[PDB]
Design an enzyme around this catalytic site. Structure first.
Site, PDB file in Angstrom:
ATOM      1  N   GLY A  42      31.820  -8.631  15.387  1.00  0.00           N
ATOM      2  CA  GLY A  42      30.505  -8.935  14.827  1.00  0.00           C
ATOM      3  C   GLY A  42      30.024 -10.265  15.407  1.00  0.00           C
ATOM      4  N   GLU A  61      29.080  -5.226  22.611  1.00  0.00           N
ATOM      5  CA  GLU A  61      29.419  -6.437  23.419  1.00  0.00           C
ATOM      6  C   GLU A  61      30.891  -6.806  23.266  1.00  0.00           C
ATOM      7  OE1 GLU A  61      25.052  -8.660  22.860  1.00  0.00           O
ATOM      8  OE2 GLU A  61      26.880  -9.587  21.966  1.00  0.00           O
ATOM      9  N   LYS A 125      41.542 -14.619   8.332  1.00  0.00           N
ATOM     10  CA  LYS A 125      40.204 -14.001   8.055  1.00  0.00           C
ATOM     11  C   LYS A 125      40.222 -13.220   6.753  1.00  0.00           C
ATOM     12  CE  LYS A 125      37.683 -14.649  11.847  1.00  0.00           C
ATOM     13  NZ  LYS A 125      38.058 -15.779  12.718  1.00  0.00           N
TER      14      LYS A 125
END
Ligand SMILES: O=P(O)(O)O[C@@H]1[C@@H](OP(=O)(O)OP(=O)(O)O)[C@@H](OP(=O)(O)O)[C@@H](OP(=O)(O)O)[C@H](O)[C@H]1OP(=O)(O)O
Ligand SMILES: [Cl-]
Ligand SMILES: [Cl-]
Ligand SMILES: [F-]
Ligand SMILES: [Mg+2]
Ligand SMILES: [Mg+2]
Ligand SMILES: [Mg+2]
Length: 134
Positions: A42, A61, A125
């Site tokens: 993200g 990407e 995370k």
């Protein structure tokens, strides 16, 4: 150009990139700063960019995949890093071989069972681990 909410939090979008409609396996990618760590792909929303459009773009990407966009899971804040992420379901239908971050920074990608994705995200995370709570 980075964009921000009214409270100064960086705007981001991400997808839970599932291998199929059963949502049993999800694609994680390596951290750019620390390549031995896993993250949910993200990144930053561009000016006037719809969050679902930013989500699909950043996945393309960073993870080199495309598919069928699904539901908004939720909006998730990271209080320490001051960012706010829209998280969407994406059912992957195309896996591309020589994607931007593969080429540019040698970013890796791997399928995880949901339980294992939560485990590898927890330490650095924990907000991204929470994406999977519901
Ligand atoms: O691109 P940024 O600088 O707005 O944010 C990236 C942060 O970028 P975002 O995903 O928030 O935004 P972009 O994907 O649009 O770069 C993210 O970078 P990456 O995208 O390279 O994974 C973070 O790395 P990691 O989560 O992979 O370890 C990175 O630390 C973080 O850099 P910071 O400015 O916080 O030092
Ligand atoms: Cl699956
Ligand atoms: Cl996070
Ligand atoms: F990015
Ligand atoms: Mg990015
Ligand atoms: Mg990113
Ligand atoms: Mg970006």
């Amino acid at each position: 150009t980075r964009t921000y909410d009214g409270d100064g939090y960086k705007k981001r979008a991400a997808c839970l990139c599932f291998r199929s409609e059963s949502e049993e396996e999800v694609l994680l990618v390596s951290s750019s700063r620390h390549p031995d760590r896993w993250i949910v792909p993200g990144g930053g929303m561009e000016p006037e960019e719809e969050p679902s459009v930013a989500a699909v773009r950043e996945v393309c990407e960073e993870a080199g995949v495309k598919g069928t966009l699904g539901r908004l899971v939720g909006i998730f804040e990271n209080q320490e890093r001051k960012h706010r992420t829209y998280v969407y379901v994406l059912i992957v239908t195309e896996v591309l071989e020589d994607w931007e971050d593969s080429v540019n920074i040698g970013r890796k990608r791997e399928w995880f069972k949901i339980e294992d994705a939560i485990k590898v995200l927890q330490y650095h995370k924990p907000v991204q681990a929470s994406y999977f709570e519901t």
